Design a protein around this ligand. Sequence first.
Ligand SMILES: [Mg+2]
Ligand SMILES: [Mg+2]
Ligand SMILES: [Mg+2]
Ligand SMILES: [Mg+2]
Ligand SMILES: [Mg+2]
Ligand SMILES: [Mg+2]
Ligand SMILES: [Mg+2]
Ligand SMILES: [Mg+2]
Ligand SMILES: [Mg+2]
Ligand SMILES: [Mg+2]
Ligand SMILES: [Mg+2]
Ligand SMILES: [Mg+2]
Ligand SMILES: [Mg+2]
Ligand SMILES: [Mg+2]
Ligand SMILES: [Mg+2]
Ligand SMILES: [Mg+2]
Ligand SMILES: [Mg+2]
Ligand SMILES: [Mg+2]
Ligand SMILES: [Mg+2]
Ligand SMILES: [Mg+2]
Ligand SMILES: [Mg+2]
Ligand SMILES: [Mg+2]
Ligand SMILES: [Mg+2]
Ligand SMILES: [Mg+2]
Ligand SMILES: [Mg+2]
Ligand SMILES: [Mg+2]
Ligand SMILES: [Mg+2]
Ligand SMILES: [Mg+2]
Ligand SMILES: [Mg+2]
Ligand SMILES: [Mg+2]
Ligand SMILES: [Mg+2]
Ligand SMILES: [Mg+2]
Ligand SMILES: [Mg+2]
Ligand SMILES: [Mg+2]
Ligand SMILES: [Mg+2]
Ligand SMILES: [Mg+2]
Ligand SMILES: [Mg+2]
Ligand SMILES: [Mg+2]
Ligand SMILES: [Mg+2]
Ligand SMILES: [Mg+2]
Ligand SMILES: [Mg+2]
Ligand SMILES: [Mg+2]
Ligand SMILES: [Mg+2]
Ligand SMILES: [Mg+2]
Ligand SMILES: [Mg+2]
Ligand SMILES: [Mg+2]
Ligand SMILES: [Mg+2]
Ligand SMILES: [Mg+2]
Ligand SMILES: [Mg+2]
Ligand SMILES: [Mg+2]
Ligand SMILES: [Mg+2]
Ligand SMILES: [Mg+2]
Ligand SMILES: [Mg+2]
Ligand SMILES: [Mg+2]
Ligand SMILES: [Mg+2]
Ligand SMILES: [Mg+2]
Ligand SMILES: [Mg+2]
Ligand SMILES: [Mg+2]
Ligand SMILES: [Mg+2]
Ligand SMILES: [Mg+2]
Ligand SMILES: [Mg+2]
Ligand SMILES: [Mg+2]
Ligand SMILES: [Mg+2]
Ligand SMILES: [Mg+2]
Ligand SMILES: [Mg+2]
Ligand SMILES: [Mg+2]
Ligand SMILES: [Mg+2]
Ligand SMILES: [Mg+2]
Ligand SMILES: [Mg+2]
Ligand SMILES: [Mg+2]
Ligand SMILES: [Mg+2]
Ligand SMILES: [Mg+2]
Ligand SMILES: [Mg+2]
Ligand SMILES: [Mg+2]
Ligand SMILES: [Mg+2]
Ligand SMILES: [Mg+2]
Ligand SMILES: [Mg+2]
Ligand SMILES: [Mg+2]
Ligand SMILES: [Mg+2]
Ligand SMILES: [Mg+2]
Ligand SMILES: [Mg+2]
Ligand SMILES: [Mg+2]
Ligand SMILES: [Mg+2]
Ligand SMILES: [Mg+2]
Ligand SMILES: [Mg+2]
Ligand SMILES: [Mg+2]
Ligand SMILES: [Mg+2]
Ligand SMILES: [Mg+2]
Ligand SMILES: [Mg+2]
Ligand SMILES: [Mg+2]
Ligand SMILES: [Mg+2]
Ligand SMILES: [Mg+2]
Ligand SMILES: [Mg+2]
Ligand SMILES: [Mg+2]
Ligand SMILES: [Mg+2]
Ligand SMILES: [Mg+2]
Ligand SMILES: [Mg+2]
Ligand SMILES: [Mg+2]
Ligand SMILES: [Mg+2]
Ligand SMILES: [Mg+2]
Ligand SMILES: [Mg+2]
Ligand SMILES: [Mg+2]
Ligand SMILES: [Mg+2]
Ligand SMILES: [Mg+2]
Ligand SMILES: [Mg+2]
Ligand SMILES: [Mg+2]
Ligand SMILES: [Mg+2]
Ligand SMILES: [Mg+2]
Ligand SMILES: [Mg+2]
Ligand SMILES: [Mg+2]
Ligand SMILES: [Mg+2]
Ligand SMILES: [Mg+2]
Ligand SMILES: [Mg+2]
Ligand SMILES: [Mg+2]
Ligand SMILES: [Mg+2]
Ligand SMILES: [Mg+2]
Ligand SMILES: [Mg+2]
Lengths: 75, 116, 92, 136, 56
Amino acid sequence: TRNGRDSEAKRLGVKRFGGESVLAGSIIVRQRGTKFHAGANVGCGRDHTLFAKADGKVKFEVKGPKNRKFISIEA
Amino acid sequence: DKKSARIRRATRARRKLQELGATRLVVHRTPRHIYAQVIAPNGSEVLVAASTVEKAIAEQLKYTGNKDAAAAVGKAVAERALEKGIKDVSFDRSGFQYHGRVQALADAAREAGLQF
Amino acid sequence: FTINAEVRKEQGKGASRRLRAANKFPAIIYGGKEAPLAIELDHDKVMNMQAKAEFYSEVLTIVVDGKEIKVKAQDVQRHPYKPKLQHIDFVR
Amino acid sequence: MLQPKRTKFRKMHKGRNRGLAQGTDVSFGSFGLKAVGRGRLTARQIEAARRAMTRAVKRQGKIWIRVFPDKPITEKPLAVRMGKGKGNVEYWVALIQPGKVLYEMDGVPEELAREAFKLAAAKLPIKTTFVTKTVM
Amino acid sequence: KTIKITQTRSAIGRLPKHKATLLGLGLRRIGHTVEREDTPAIRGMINAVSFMVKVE
RNA sequence: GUGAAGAGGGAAACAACCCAGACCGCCAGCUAAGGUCCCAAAGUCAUGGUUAAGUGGGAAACGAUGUGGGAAGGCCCAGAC
RNA sequence: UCCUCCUAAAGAGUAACGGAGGAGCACGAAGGUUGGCUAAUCCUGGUCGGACAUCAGGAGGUUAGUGCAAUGGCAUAAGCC
RNA sequence: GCUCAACGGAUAAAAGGUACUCCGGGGAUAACAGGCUGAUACCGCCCAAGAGUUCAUAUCGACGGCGGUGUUUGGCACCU
RNA sequence: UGCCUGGCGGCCGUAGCGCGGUGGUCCCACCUGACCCCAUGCCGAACUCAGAAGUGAAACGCCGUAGCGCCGAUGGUAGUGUGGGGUCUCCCCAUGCGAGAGUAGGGAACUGCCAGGCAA
Ligand SMILES: [Mg+2]
Ligand SMILES: [Mg+2]
Ligand SMILES: [Mg+2]
Ligand SMILES: [Mg+2]
Ligand SMILES: [Mg+2]
Ligand SMILES: [Mg+2]
Ligand SMILES: [Mg+2]
Ligand SMILES: [Mg+2]
Ligand SMILES: [Mg+2]
Ligand SMILES: [Mg+2]
Ligand SMILES: [Mg+2]
Ligand SMILES: [Mg+2]
Ligand SMILES: [Mg+2]
Ligand SMILES: [Mg+2]
Ligand SMILES: [Mg+2]
Ligand SMILES: [Mg+2]
Ligand SMILES: [Mg+2]
Ligand SMILES: [Mg+2]
Ligand SMILES: [Mg+2]
Ligand SMILES: [Mg+2]
Ligand SMILES: [Mg+2]
Ligand SMILES: [Mg+2]
Ligand SMILES: [Mg+2]
Ligand SMILES: [Mg+2]
Ligand SMILES: [Mg+2]
Ligand SMILES: [Mg+2]
Ligand SMILES: [Mg+2]
Ligand SMILES: [Mg+2]
Ligand SMILES: [Mg+2]
Ligand SMILES: [Mg+2]
Ligand SMILES: [Mg+2]
Ligand SMILES: [Mg+2]
Ligand SMILES: [Mg+2]
Ligand SMILES: [Mg+2]
Ligand SMILES: [Mg+2]
Ligand SMILES: [Mg+2]
Ligand SMILES: [Mg+2]
Ligand SMILES: [Mg+2]
Ligand SMILES: [Mg+2]
Ligand SMILES: [Mg+2]
Ligand SMILES: [Mg+2]
Ligand SMILES: [Mg+2]
Ligand SMILES: [Mg+2]
Ligand SMILES: [Mg+2]
Ligand SMILES: [Mg+2]
Ligand SMILES: [Mg+2]
Ligand SMILES: [Mg+2]
Ligand SMILES: [Mg+2]
Ligand SMILES: [Mg+2]
Ligand SMILES: [Mg+2]
Ligand SMILES: [Mg+2]
Ligand SMILES: [Mg+2]
Ligand SMILES: [Mg+2]
Ligand SMILES: [Mg+2]
Ligand SMILES: [Mg+2]
Ligand SMILES: [Mg+2]
Ligand SMILES: [Mg+2]
Ligand SMILES: [Mg+2]
Ligand SMILES: [Mg+2]
Ligand SMILES: [Mg+2]
Ligand SMILES: [Mg+2]
Ligand SMILES: [Mg+2]
Ligand SMILES: [Mg+2]
Ligand SMILES: [Mg+2]
Ligand SMILES: [Mg+2]
Ligand SMILES: [Mg+2]
Ligand SMILES: [Mg+2]
Ligand SMILES: [Mg+2]
Ligand SMILES: [Mg+2]
Ligand SMILES: [Mg+2]
Ligand SMILES: [Mg+2]
Ligand SMILES: [Mg+2]
Ligand SMILES: [Mg+2]
Ligand SMILES: [Mg+2]
Ligand SMILES: [Mg+2]
Ligand SMILES: [Mg+2]
Ligand SMILES: [Mg+2]
Ligand SMILES: [Mg+2]
Ligand SMILES: [Mg+2]
Ligand SMILES: [Mg+2]
Ligand SMILES: [Mg+2]
Ligand SMILES: [Mg+2]
Ligand SMILES: [Mg+2]
Ligand SMILES: [Mg+2]
Ligand SMILES: [Mg+2]
Ligand SMILES: [Mg+2]
Ligand SMILES: [Mg+2]
Ligand SMILES: [Mg+2]
Ligand SMILES: [Mg+2]
Ligand SMILES: [Mg+2]
Ligand SMILES: [Mg+2]
Ligand SMILES: [Mg+2]
Ligand SMILES: [Mg+2]
Ligand SMILES: [Mg+2]
Ligand SMILES: [Mg+2]
Ligand SMILES: [Mg+2]
Ligand SMILES: [Mg+2]
Ligand SMILES: [Mg+2]
Ligand SMILES: [Mg+2]
Ligand SMILES: [Mg+2]
Ligand SMILES: [Mg+2]
Ligand SMILES: [Mg+2]
Ligand SMILES: [Mg+2]
Ligand SMILES: [Mg+2]
Ligand SMILES: [Mg+2]
Ligand SMILES: [Mg+2]
Ligand SMILES: [Mg+2]
Ligand SMILES: [Mg+2]
Ligand SMILES: [Mg+2]
Ligand SMILES: [Mg+2]
Ligand SMILES: [Mg+2]
Ligand SMILES: [Mg+2]
Ligand SMILES: [Mg+2]
Ligand SMILES: [Mg+2]
Ligand SMILES: [Mg+2]
Ligand SMILES: [Mg+2]
Ligand SMILES: [Mg+2]
């Protein structure tokens, strides 16, 4: 065969889903590009990894001019 | 169109400043007149607002649209802001280059007592 | 150009197929300010009716519960390969 | 022999020819050869069935071909073991579900149409039927 | 108001969820007339394994 | 899911298919799959049709006034086939 | 050995001598931050100058660009200054 | 300070021959035969563009299509 | 109370395009000017400052229109969870869920605080 190669899988996705209680610093979404965006009390690291900046429940929203998915946290 | 280029030039400040959840002092400049308003951290409701369009301030000045007028507004806003109970604020220049009238407004707002 | 037609009570995939496998097929009447009306009717008549070119142009008066409703055949669903009708949309 | 002029990928998965067809109504011509059965028509079969039609109706009339291959079929050579790569693309096929109009015809009589579609229908693996363009 | 449920089929060649559902109803063997309190849940449990249980 | 590591009844015989999970005993009764004229436990059961090929009891393209149902479409008393 | 896509059956994971491509670096500015900016490709007019160099206006709007594959992402621009 | 790239790296340091061979094992794995399969092979059939002085179906039958057989080349590795 | 502007949101196409309009007393715009503040990899075009002769052209705001975009039932269809079945590459049946596309139709956004002018 000419090919027969592949990389190791990266385990990317929504780790904590909407409504779930998360602790301050908990990773909510591992992904490549900002598919989801950082809302209230949610960060965005160098890897575009969205993480909780406060102890609370995760909230998925669909707002903005371009209709993007945002992840917020509400205590 | 110019306006639309000024809105997007401002947006980065606004969207960064609403994330922090800070009370922003918006300053809309115009060839004739200058405006200024202290807006609540939510962004919807206004707490304090003043301008050269207000007759109370317009009656005093020579011409409404210059550095000496901007100071008269900048003083007026910060004079109200302290009476309401506001002190710690942010300054949203609103896509206007921080140099002339807006600087004269900002420095007057600092010299009046408003803390930023 | 007059056909007697019953009112539907069961409606879905289970009912429709049971109906279609009983010499009949489902249709619907709709238009104007009134609510839509789901209408069961016989196959062998309406199959012979569609051969005439007037069917897809002229006004048909469908008889339901005594009342005669005036309609035009807007849209229609043929069975993929077998020569038979699945469903008709009667605009008012 | 019909084939895509350049594609993204050379070799395609086998897949599963399921469901009903979409190109069901007779759109362009007056008559049409509808596929009753399920199957897959090769590039050769389509040409062979076209030649059988076009020669029956002579120079007159107009014919369409609603189906096109765009699916490469691979085949492993003779005296070759399993594995050691996906086989080489030999021929091209169009997957045909039930209901799919294959050929369409116009500018001929109804009497002479059916006879022309029999000659094509004989060439094809799939069981077919005659269909007329009904107005809505 | 209670409802009498009876197991009328074996729980051998069944899905783990259907193996669970009978453990949630409390049915052990075929021909076990277990009666339970009628709620929206228990009717759902019966609806999940309706093929192998009978209601009185 | 089953076997592996699960016997028992059925699929003629048939680890994995259908039914069903053997603690031990009894010359008790009710059922599952599957069956009920004889080999062999139980319907030569009841009613309404189909089949004439021993189909049932291996198979395709295609072929044919086989034979049942239907829903239509061509003509009569000026008498069509 | 490492990265990307599909196979992978709408969380993650998932094989084959299955299907296609890349990497063994680059950069004291290509980092930081502040303040700005907006693209492709055409149309018409214009010296040498022509399809295309540079200019003007109009059209399209992210087909662009992203130090390198592929993926996801970016006008608040992560783009170019 | 290592293409320790056979990239969880056996040593700092390593290629071949055996038909002169031997021991331990395997039908976990090939060569013969069997089996399952039937791409290929063989054997039929379906449509009819043409040849045949004219005339498709006396005899051939292109383009295509559908089966059988287990007779060839194969595949698989289920028995030994 | 209302009618007109501006500022900042909420909501992101029923909210956007085009076309047809109409508005200048303030509001906004161009416009005026270029020691001073500042600006151009050239250029007061841009950004900036000092202004008040002009206009509502352009840009903007408001009213009007379906040419598009956009929203979108009911019914059917596809698909599919579970237990069955068949003539088993593919279907079908009971029961649960149930699209997408199209169709009737909808459809020139709806608002929040705050400021100014005018009829009160
Ligand atoms: Mg991957
Ligand atoms: Mg993988
Ligand atoms: Mg808890
Ligand atoms: Mg960081
Ligand atoms: Mg419904
Ligand atoms: Mg169903
Ligand atoms: Mg109406
Ligand atoms: Mg081509
Ligand atoms: Mg699939
Ligand atoms: Mg499709
Ligand atoms: Mg289509
Ligand atoms: Mg090879
Ligand atoms: Mg009991
Ligand atoms: Mg009991
Ligand atoms: Mg063992
Ligand atoms: Mg057993
Ligand atoms: Mg047994
Ligand atoms: Mg036995
Ligand atoms: Mg048997
Ligand atoms: Mg066996
Ligand atoms: Mg046995
Ligand atoms: Mg059973
Ligand atoms: Mg048990
Ligand atoms: Mg058990
Ligand atoms: Mg037991
Ligand atoms: Mg015992
Ligand atoms: Mg009893
Ligand atoms: Mg008994
Ligand atoms: Mg039985
Ligand atoms: Mg029997
Ligand atoms: Mg016997
Ligand atoms: Mg026996
Ligand atoms: Mg007996
Ligand atoms: Mg007798
Ligand atoms: Mg009898
Ligand atoms: Mg009889
Ligand atoms: Mg039979
Ligand atoms: Mg036979
Ligand atoms: Mg036949
Ligand atoms: Mg016949
Ligand atoms: Mg008969
Ligand atoms: Mg008959
Ligand atoms: Mg009869
Ligand atoms: Mg009848
Ligand atoms: Mg009759
Ligand atoms: Mg590895
Ligand atoms: Mg995909
Ligand atoms: Mg996947
Ligand atoms: Mg996945
Ligand atoms: Mg999955
Ligand atoms: Mg793991
Ligand atoms: Mg595995
Ligand atoms: Mg792999
Ligand atoms: Mg390589
Ligand atoms: Mg330096
Ligand atoms: Mg730089
Ligand atoms: Mg930098
Ligand atoms: Mg500076
Ligand atoms: Mg910047
Ligand atoms: Mg691009
Ligand atoms: Mg990309
Ligand atoms: Mg640069
Ligand atoms: Mg090293
Ligand atoms: Mg090694
Ligand atoms: Mg090595
Ligand atoms: Mg290794
Ligand atoms: Mg590894
Ligand atoms: Mg090693
Ligand atoms: Mg030897
Ligand atoms: Mg030897
Ligand atoms: Mg020796
Ligand atoms: Mg030995
Ligand atoms: Mg092995
Ligand atoms: Mg041999
Ligand atoms: Mg052998
Ligand atoms: Mg055999
Ligand atoms: Mg065999
Ligand atoms: Mg064969
Ligand atoms: Mg023959
Ligand atoms: Mg023949
Ligand atoms: Mg012959
Ligand atoms: Mg045969
Ligand atoms: Mg043999
Ligand atoms: Mg073996
Ligand atoms: Mg094996
Ligand atoms: Mg043996
Ligand atoms: Mg435009
Ligand atoms: Mg506009
Ligand atoms: Mg006027
Ligand atoms: Mg100027
Ligand atoms: Mg004037
Ligand atoms: Mg004026
Ligand atoms: Mg105008
Ligand atoms: Mg408007
Ligand atoms: Mg309308
Ligand atoms: Mg909407
Ligand atoms: Mg839509
Ligand atoms: Mg929408
Ligand atoms: Mg709906
Ligand atoms: Mg409704
Ligand atoms: Mg529906
Ligand atoms: Mg399903
Ligand atoms: Mg099932
Ligand atoms: Mg059954
Ligand atoms: Mg829904
Ligand atoms: Mg819908
Ligand atoms: Mg739609
Ligand atoms: Mg469409
Ligand atoms: Mg329409
Ligand atoms: Mg209405
Ligand atoms: Mg209308
Ligand atoms: Mg509109
Ligand atoms: Mg409009
Ligand atoms: Mg309006
Ligand atoms: Mg209206
Ligand atoms: Mg709305
Ligand atoms: Mg409005």
